Every structure is written in structure tokens, then in C-alpha cells.
Amino acid sequence: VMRRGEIWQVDLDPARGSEANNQRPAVVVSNDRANATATRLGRGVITVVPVTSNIAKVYPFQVLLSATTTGLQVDCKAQAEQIRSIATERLLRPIGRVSAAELAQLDEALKLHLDLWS
Amino acid sequence: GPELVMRRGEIWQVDLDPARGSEANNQRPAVVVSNDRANATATRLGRGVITVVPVTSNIAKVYPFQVLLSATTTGLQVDCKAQAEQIRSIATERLLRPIGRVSAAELAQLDEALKLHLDLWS
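ok -> C-alpha cells follow
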């Protein structure tokens, strides 16, 4: 049981170059039928958007996540340009859930970054 | 190695290792799906991250989140299928060489597969 919108701590190592690395929170963004399939076999993959506490300059393909509603300890930003499909074994520990507003803007960021305007 | 001129829809050979579980692994073709503003930025800076869809020649069953890619037009040596469920942002340091490009109809199917997989509507 993992669901779209949930924030999990995930293990991204090893990484190369500007790829998000270390262990960090990430938002599940794959659909829940795929999530259910991945949990079924046990293996399978799920797609997540990594999160960083280094807010700095926020781009239109990135979304500010509130520590107050997510369970995070500080406000972070989800980087849609770092989207990654991961083996379920990289899931470490659940932290929380994004609001509906935050998730909707993350759908917008994904559509922008991947040029999915239709 | 290569000059970083990758653009959306192109097929490039990329190094995905090391990988865990069902993650697409080793060096294999993948389809560039990140927007060309970001890709051109990566060209200008000579570094960045490029979002790709890895490819497998194990056709088997083509699910709605996967797209059949023909050997005739891609420059691939056999028919392959793009796996939207394996979408991954990768360092430009992982790009090995350009292979070719998918057709516009194939890229449109890949757009639909991505929207399906990531639960997006437009």
C-alpha cells in the first residue's frame, strides 16, 4: 500500500552528476493501479519526484511543499525535473501526504517539464 | 563523449547502471521526453539532467503505458518498446551516442502513455 501523493523517504544512491542523491523524501506520482501492481508482484517499479530542502530559486516545474501539512520537518520543493522510476525496495519509510492543492500543482509541473500539453 | 545536442523524441544510447530490482539497467536505447527548453539549456551549459523513457527489445505484451517502436524508422536494429513506467531523469554524463528518433505518431503515443502512467489529464 503506497498511493499517489504520499511522501516517502527513498534511497537514491548511487547517483551521477546532477541527479538527486543520498536518501531524501519523494512524492509518489505514478497512478494507483500501477502502484497496486508493483505491490502485487513485490518487485515492479513506482515513479517518484524527489524533494529538496535547498529551496533557493524555484522554477515553474517545481512545487513548494509545506512542512505543516506533509509531515516534513521543513518546507521543501519537489523537483519535477528529477522524476525517477524506482524499484519498490528503495522505499525506506513513509513520512506523509501532500495536500490536493500541492498535488494538482505538481501535475502542472509535470505537464510543463515533460511537454504534455496534449 | 558525444556533443550534448539531445532533443525531445530522439533515441540515444544511455548508461543506466547501476540499477536495483526491476529498474531498466545496463547501456540501452532511450527516448528523450524532457522539453526542449530544458534540453537546449543543457546544451548551452554543457551539463544537466535529461528525462528519458528506456527501451526494451523484449516485446512480449505491449501494455497501454508502453509504445511499440519500429526498426524501420528509429535506426534500431530490432523492434523495441518504450516503457513509460521506467521514465527516469539522468545525468548528461550518462549519454553515450545518438541512435535515431521516433516518428511523430510514436511520440504522440508516448505522450499518451506518460499521461496515463503519471495520472495526468490535459
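The first strand of chain A starts at residue 6 and ends at 11.
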